[PDB]
Amino acid sequence: SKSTAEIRQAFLDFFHSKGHQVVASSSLVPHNDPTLLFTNAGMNQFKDVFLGLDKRNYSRATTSQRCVRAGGKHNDLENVGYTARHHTFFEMLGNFSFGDYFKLDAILFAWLLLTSEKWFALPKERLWVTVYESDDEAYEIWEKEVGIPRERIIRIGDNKGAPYASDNFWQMGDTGPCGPCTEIFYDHGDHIWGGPPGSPEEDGDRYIEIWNIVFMQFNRQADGTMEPLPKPSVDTGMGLERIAAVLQHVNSNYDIDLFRTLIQAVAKVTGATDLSNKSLRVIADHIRSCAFLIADGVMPSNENRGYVLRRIIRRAVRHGNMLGAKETFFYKLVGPLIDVMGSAGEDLKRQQAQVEQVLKTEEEQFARTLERGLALLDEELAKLSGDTLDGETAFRLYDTYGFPVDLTADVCRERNIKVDEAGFEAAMEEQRRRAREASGF
Numbered sequence: 001s002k003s004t005a006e007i008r009q010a011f012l013d014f015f016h017s018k019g020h021q022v023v024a025s026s027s028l029v030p031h032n033d034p035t036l037l038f039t040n041a042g043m044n045q046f047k048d049v050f051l052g053l054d055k056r057n058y059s060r061a062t063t064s065q066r067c068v069r070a071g072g073k074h075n076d077l078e079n080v081g082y083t084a085r086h087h088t089f090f091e092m093l094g095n096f097s098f099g100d101y102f103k104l105d106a107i108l109f110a111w112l113l114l115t116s117e118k119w120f121a122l123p124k125e126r127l128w129v130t131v132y133e134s135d136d137e138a139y140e141i142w143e144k145e146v147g148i149p150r151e152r153i154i155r156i157g158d159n160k161g162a163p164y165a166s167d168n169f170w171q172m173g174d175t176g177p178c179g180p181c182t183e184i185f186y187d188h189g190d191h192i193w194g195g196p197p198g199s200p201e202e203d204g205d206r207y208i209e210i211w212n213i214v215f216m217q218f219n220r221q222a223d224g225t226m227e228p229l230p231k232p233s234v235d236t237g238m239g240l241e242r243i244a245a246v247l248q249h250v251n252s253n254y255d256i257d258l259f260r261t262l263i264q265a266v267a268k269v270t271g272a273t274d275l276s277n278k279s280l281r282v283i284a285d286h287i288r289s290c291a292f293l294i295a296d297g298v299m300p301s302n303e304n305r306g307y308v309l310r311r312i313i314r315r316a317v318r319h320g321n322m323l324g325a326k327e328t329f330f331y332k333l334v335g336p337l338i339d340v341m342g343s344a345g346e347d348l349k350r351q352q353a354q355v356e357q358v359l360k361t362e363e364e365q366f367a368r369t370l371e372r373g374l375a376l377l378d379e380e381l382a383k384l385s386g387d388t389l390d391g392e393t394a395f396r397l398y399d400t401y402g403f404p405v406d407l408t409a410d411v412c413r414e415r416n417i418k419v420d421e422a423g424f425e426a427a428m429e430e431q432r433r434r435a436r437e438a439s440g441f
């Protein structure tokens, strides 16, 4: 089968052959978008084009965009290691129409690449589609233009409990370009638990969302109102790792060539032998987001972007501890990562030594309190009555040992114990008040 690198290139070659300008992935860190934490979609760098504020010399484009979804509007951090399909760092394969073509041709391009004998040649019978309930045009296109049997065309409304809150209405953020969308799912088969989209078991890893095609129509305002974009446009995105799994005849993202190699490297540096332990997958995921974020300029800190990076590094180190890592290990995975990323790792390779030192320093710094804090947590859990760790203890781990609350929650979750988040926040607020009282005016 095709390697991840070959699939990435084949996607771009397809759209290039269809007249799309190949554009380089943007950084994970925007210089000119105050509303955006980290790049979470291929469309981010074209935001102003969709808004009609910027015009390029091309009206259609294609990219393989590095994305991190670990905060802000789209955050999958807590899914990592619990599903076969979610990462913090991933590549989104995208095509874009800036007032060029619209619904029918967007859908045809996608179907052609996926199912043509000349291209990916996926079995059509295993593909399902969803449309926004009110999108009668998208429904008709799939039904009559493409020819998907009606039983595999699913209408989804505002299933997230609010107007425009839907798996089939995509929003860049609380503000920004958005619109109704249609998604393509691949059925991995009955050896995996799960039901089709719209079903009670839709959240399973059996029917995987491969490609989202967004019909950009509005700019969302902070108050929740929708202002029409000047020109209806197209924003699509397919997870490289998810389509690689399909094409490589495996079920999990972590079974593709890229992750198999990377997970072997994690086992090597941690001393783990069981290649099925979920901590190996978590660390493999985390090195991707951490290394690339540092390459794109993020430095560990206790505020904003730096704190998200710090949180992910420390969670990765903690997982290494659970695996029994005896020495500093996380920075050792930068080399192996560069080796599996191909051309998509160019920016990381360029700054290898720098990224390695940042990761090494951060792990060494955390090791000053990691084992001691875990010892305290074990002590508190051993005598804990109930299913919830008190907020005072969570705050003590934070304040004394530098444990972000989500790191503590992650450890506790592995033992079916919850964390009293309201209690943690109450403790933080109490300390804030003490700081105000002491500092004065």
Ligand SMILES: Nc1ncnc2c1ncn2[C@@H]1O[C@H](COS(=O)(=O)NC(=O)[C@@H](N)CO)[C@@H](O)[C@H]1O
Binding pocket: 040, 041, 042, 043, 069, 076, 085, 086, 087, 088, 089, 090, 092, 094, 170, 209, 210, 211, 212, 213, 214, 235, 236, 237, 238, 239, 240, 241, 242
């Ligand atoms: N956390 C994640 N891990 C791995 N793959 C993901 C993750 N989030 C999204 N994807 C993949 O990226 C595709 C596009 O993401 S999307 O949120 O659904 N859609 C968008 O971002 C829109 N901008 C359309 O491009 C998804 O269909 C899925 O295949």
